């Protein structure tokens, strides 16, 4: 039975986007909590996003894995589109990078492993994320990741991304592919241990210069196996990044030495290492 706004008690504003509101809400019949993303119909029509919105609904409705934000339901009324989302109580990963500066090797290994597991599922369903970055990696109450923001995703272009995580093949060919998420994964891993993403500059253009050049440095304290793995992800040729299809996918990436002690079968059941 299709839900209705009156079925819920809306509580605190969790956040706002350019054209959205996300509020915490309790379903009255079940007492379940949801983050409900609310969209003004008018704004969406003034910018020709009716397909774009449907694609985000469709893509998220194919995601039933513990490391992605679940879409439980959608509904509408006269002015709004409503998206029933699982509630990620602890916010963006970016917040913890800023709070503690950078991760020790245990926390790096753990959260990287979860992202790898996430990408293995997403690419297994033929979906490119295209905007993977710590802003878009939420954390639930148990401190497990919850990847979100699927408006820009691609189901097996266009020009999307965030400058610091965009892959070279985007700025050179306008054609993203599964391997483009592995580039972003390379940048995220570097950001976890270094404290900053690897391609840094004053403005978007100079950042773009460094990516096509592969102009970046490792600091001396970078964990050696983490650096080795990044070097096998920050690779210009998108057919040569570890984990991509042309290198037989996620098996060889999950077998990299940085993940030696990882148990991939119950990562989502393990208690994450505390972030200090």
């Amino acid at each position: 039975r299709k839900k209705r706004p009156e079925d819920f008690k809306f509580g605190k504003i969790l956040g706002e986007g350019s054209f959205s509101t996300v509020v915490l809400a309790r379903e009255l019949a079940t007492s379940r909590e949801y983050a409900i993303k609310i969209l003004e119909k008018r704004h969406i029509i003034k910018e020709n996003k009716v397909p774009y919105v449907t694609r985000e609904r469709d893509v998220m409705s194919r995601l039933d894995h513990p490391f992605f934000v679940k879409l439980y339901f959608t509904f509408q009324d006269d002015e709004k589109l409503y998206f029933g989302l699982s509630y990620a109580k602890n916010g963006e990963l970016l917040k913890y990078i800023r709070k503690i500066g950078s991760f020790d090797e245990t926390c790096t290994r753990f959260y990287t492993a979860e992202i790898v597991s996430a990408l293995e599922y997403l690419h297994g369903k033929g979906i490119i994320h295209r905007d993977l970055k710590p802003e878009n990696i939420l954390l639930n109450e148990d401190m497990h990741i919850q990847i979100t923001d699927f408006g820009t995703a691609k189901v097996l272009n266009s020009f999307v991304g965030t400058a610091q995580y965009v892959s070279p093949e985007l700025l050179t060919e306008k054609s993203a592919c599964k391997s483009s998420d592995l580039w972003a994964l390379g940048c995220i891993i570097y950001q976890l241990v270094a404290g900053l993403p690897p391609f840094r500059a004053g403005n978007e253009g100079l950042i773009f210069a460094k990516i096509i050049k592969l102009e970046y440095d490792f600091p001396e304290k970078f964990f050696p196996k983490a650096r080795d793995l990044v070097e096998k992800l920050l690779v210009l040729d998108a057919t040569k990044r570890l984990g991509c299809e042309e290198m037989e996918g996620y098996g060889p990436l999950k077998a990299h030495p940085f993940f030696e002690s990882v148990t991939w079968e119950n990562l989502h059941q393990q208690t994450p290492p505390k972030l200090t």
Partner: peptide
């Protein structure tokens, strides 16, 4: 928005 509504 025709058949938007979805559950699940």
């Amino acid at each position: 928005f025709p058949q938007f509504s979805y559950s699940a």
